[PDB]
Design a protein around this ligand. Structure first.
Ligand SMILES: [Zn+2]
Ligand SMILES: [Zn+2]
Ligand SMILES: [Zn+2]
Lengths: 6, 76
């Protein structure tokens, strides 16, 4: 998955 | 407004954690740090909502990667 950090 | 699910702080101009399977689950770094501290005492770190939300497409709770933990715990 992509990083959860925005 | 885009706000932390736990403390309700507005997220504009700050970094935050976005739960993959629940768009409304968003967490500021201070709250994420507390959640990592609380959860990591006993294992993997799941969604800070407490709801053990799944990965998109797989029936398993998502959990922070080590690199995400390191990014969050480094400080601002
Ligand atoms: Zn917060
Ligand atoms: Zn979630
Ligand atoms: Zn995961």
């Amino acid at each position: 998955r992509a990083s959860v950090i925005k | 407004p885009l706000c932390c699910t736990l403390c309700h702080e507005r997220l504009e101009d700050t970094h935050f954690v976005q739960c993959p399977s629940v768009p409304s689950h968003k967490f500021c770094f201070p709250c994420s740090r507390q959640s990592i501290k609380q959860q990591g005492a006993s294992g993997e770190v799941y969604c800070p909502s407490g709801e053990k939300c799944p990965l998109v497409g797989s029936n398993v709770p998502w959990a922070f990667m080590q690199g995400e933990i390191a990014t969050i715990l480094a400080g601002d």
